[PDB]
Amino acid sequence: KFNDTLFGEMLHGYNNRTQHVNQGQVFQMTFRENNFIKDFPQLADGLLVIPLPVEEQCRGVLSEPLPDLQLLTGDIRYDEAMGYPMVQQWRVRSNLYRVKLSTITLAAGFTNVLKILTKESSREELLSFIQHYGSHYIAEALYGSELTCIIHFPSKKVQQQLWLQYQKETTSMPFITYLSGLLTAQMLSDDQLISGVEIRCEEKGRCPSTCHLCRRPGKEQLSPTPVLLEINRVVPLYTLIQDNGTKEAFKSALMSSYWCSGKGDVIDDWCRCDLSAFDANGLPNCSPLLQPVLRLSPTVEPSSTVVSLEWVDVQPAIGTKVSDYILQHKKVDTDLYTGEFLSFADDLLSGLGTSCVAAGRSHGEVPEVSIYSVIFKCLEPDGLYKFTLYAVDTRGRHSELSTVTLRTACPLVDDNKAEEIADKIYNLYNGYTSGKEQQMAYNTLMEVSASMLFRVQHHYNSHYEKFGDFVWRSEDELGPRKAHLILRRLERVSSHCSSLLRSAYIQSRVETVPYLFCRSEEVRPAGMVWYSILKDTKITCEEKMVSMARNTYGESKGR
Ligand SMILES: *[C@@H]1O[C@H](CO)[C@@H](O[C@@H]2O[C@H](CO)[C@@H](O[C@@H]3O[C@H](CO[C@H]4O[C@H](CO[C@H]5O[C@H](CO)[C@@H](O)[C@H](O)[C@@H]5O[C@H]5O[C@H](CO)[C@@H](O)[C@H](O)[C@@H]5O)[C@@H](O)[C@H](O[C@H]5O[C@H](CO)[C@@H](O)[C@H](O)[C@@H]5O[C@H]5O[C@H](CO)[C@@H](O)[C@H](O)[C@@H]5O)[C@@H]4O)[C@@H](O)[C@H](O[C@H]4O[C@H](CO)[C@@H](O)[C@H](O)[C@@H]4O[C@H]4O[C@H](CO)[C@@H](O)[C@H](O)[C@@H]4O)[C@@H]3O)[C@H](O)[C@H]2NC(C)=O)[C@H](O)[C@H]1NC(C)=O
Ligand SMILES: O=P(O)(O)O[C@@H]1[C@H](O)[C@H](O)[C@@H](OP(=O)(O)O)[C@H](OP(=O)(O)O)[C@H]1O
Ligand SMILES: *[C@@H]1O[C@H](CO)[C@@H](O)[C@H](O)[C@H]1NC(C)=O
């Protein structure tokens, strides 16, 4: 049967790869020593439970707002006027205990199988041990009750307004409960600044009755049992072998299961895949080549004619090495069609190239994982684009492909010029007679872009619709092929633009943002069947700046 007690997972053993606790039973649980806490039963022997200080108990932290990274990976889609959808995390910890174990004798069943395997040096056998007992045992861990909530805002603007609106009316109340208060009360009203806000919570261990920051109407509870939150320290199970002969042979079997998928031995810096791990093309397949997740840049919202993308290196610390990243891109309108092919090593770092595409490599969250990036600066406005990415290893395998589809913003529109043209066109249509007027009216309408023509239609109908619709009146005064010609141009404007271009006001802000521009100093030696490691390529990186002109839509100029 399964021996289960509180604190709990410390005696059973932990796997690093699959991240599962309760993997066999490493240490024995006894109750000779008398360890109690509060209302909990008798603790197992040899584990030290220390409640955290009162400063840490029932304390909540509100993270800074960031774009929703999940909504920047696949079919990327958001209102151009809104911007990136934002998320902000709220987290409250309430029933905290720090749990270490020292000192405990080993389990009976653990030592039994440890006694028979220590002489039997076998690979398939040592792997079945790790399946059952895991790889480590937990040395230090944090237990308690934590409530993790995520506030989903529709835009960066909506949040800032809500945060300043909250900061005014509070100066008592946390930010999330103020939002939840206005979310629940919205059943009284309807549309407002809080229209699209959503809150999503997930609880590890129920909220205690004493703490008021994690209190949720019905889920309150008196003295809840603490749940494992963090694993602070792990120690490998080859510490427990007690001999040098087996604990070196066990260690190599552990590295095989972790780094080489259990189908190969690890020489320093790489996996020696035993046959037949090799794939369909006869290339080493024991170390996994992961899918690189292509992302939009969180810091640079795409503008019309411009997109900048990111991805984190898929190269493990041990095993596969990435030699190149292949990035294809096409404008759709098709499907199942191959577009421009860009090798990161050959086309982006070595061959210009510029000034339409630039690449870059940077240090990421915690080195050493690299953050590759590429920026497109000569795209076309109001166009749907598809970017695909895959990695190529040193021995030639392709990774699983990854895709991003998104649309560049609408073209820029001088709203003053549009309302000015609409008046010019109306006073010509009221002049009637001249064929110069007819030609000049047709010329000015055709010489300006389709989005501008859609905007002068919006302005003409806003003012002069009672004396004739823009289309209908253009047909009366100019003739109907010139009309139909004007009219077809309006059809080339998509209708997210056409929706946005029916707004009250369109204003232009100009953002200026940096991007990393890296080039390859050293051309690396490549063989026929093997290639050079892309990470080792020496590169010279320089910071540059893009100016990004954007339209600003709204029903009034106050933002
Ligand atoms: C859950 O479960 C597991 C539980 O254990 C966890 O698994 C552990 O993960 C750790 C983290 O990833 C692992 O630690 C990392 O190991 C790697 C691999 O190191 C081995 O190979 C190295 C390769 O050496 C090359 O170059 C030397 C020249 O000096 C040559 O001699 C070699 O031959 C080899 O290259 C060529 O080999 C042949 C030619 O012979 C050809 O095919 C090619 O030409 C090859 O290129 C090697 O350096 C290591 O050697 C150490 O160990 C020897 C004994 O085993 C010892 O004799 C050595 O002296 C050395 O020990 C000392 O030096 C190292 C390095 O300074 C120290 O780490 C160590 O503590 C000692 O001081 C080893 O054989 C290793 O590369 C990693 O090191 C990088 O990352 C750490 C960050 O942790 C940095 O601090 C380092 O500076 C280094 O960073 C540099 O390199 C990166 C790679 O390019 C680069 O990205 C960086 O920018 C920077 O340049 C780590 O040490 C650990 O091994 C692993 N354990 C097990 C049991 O699997 C798992 O992670 C965990 N998961 C969790 C917790 O989430
Ligand atoms: O050391 P060099 O001069 O750069 O060239 C090595 C050579 O191409 C080996 O054939 C190759 O191993 P295999 O062809 O057998 O796969 C090795 O890769 P590796 O050491 O990472 O295995 C390369 O490093
Ligand atoms: C349960 O605990 C006993 C110690 O009394 C131990 O002998 C037994 O092996 C444990 N059960 C399992 C499945 O490990």
Residue numbers in the entry: 717 to 887, 897 to 1058, 1063 to 1288
Could you give the paper's own sentences about this structure?
Our focus here is on a PLP especially identified as being involved in neurodevelopment, astrotacin-2 (ASTN-2). ASTN-1 and ASTN-2 have been shown to interact directly with each other in vitro in a calcium-independent way with multiple regions of each protein apparently contributing to their interface. Both ASTN-1 and ASTN-2 are integral membrane proteins in which a large C-terminal domain (extracellular for ASTN-1, endosome luminal for ASTN-2) is complemented by an N-terminal cytosolic domain suspended between two transmembrane α-helices. Thus, the endosomal regions of ASTN-2 comprise a smaller N-terminal domain and a larger C-terminal domain whose structure we report here and which we refer to as its endodomain. We describe its unique combination of a canonical MACPF/CDC domain with a minimal epidermal growth factor (EGF)-like repeat (EGF-4), a previously unobserved type of fibronectin type III (Fn(III)) domain in which an additional two β-strands are folded across the core, and an annexin-like domain.
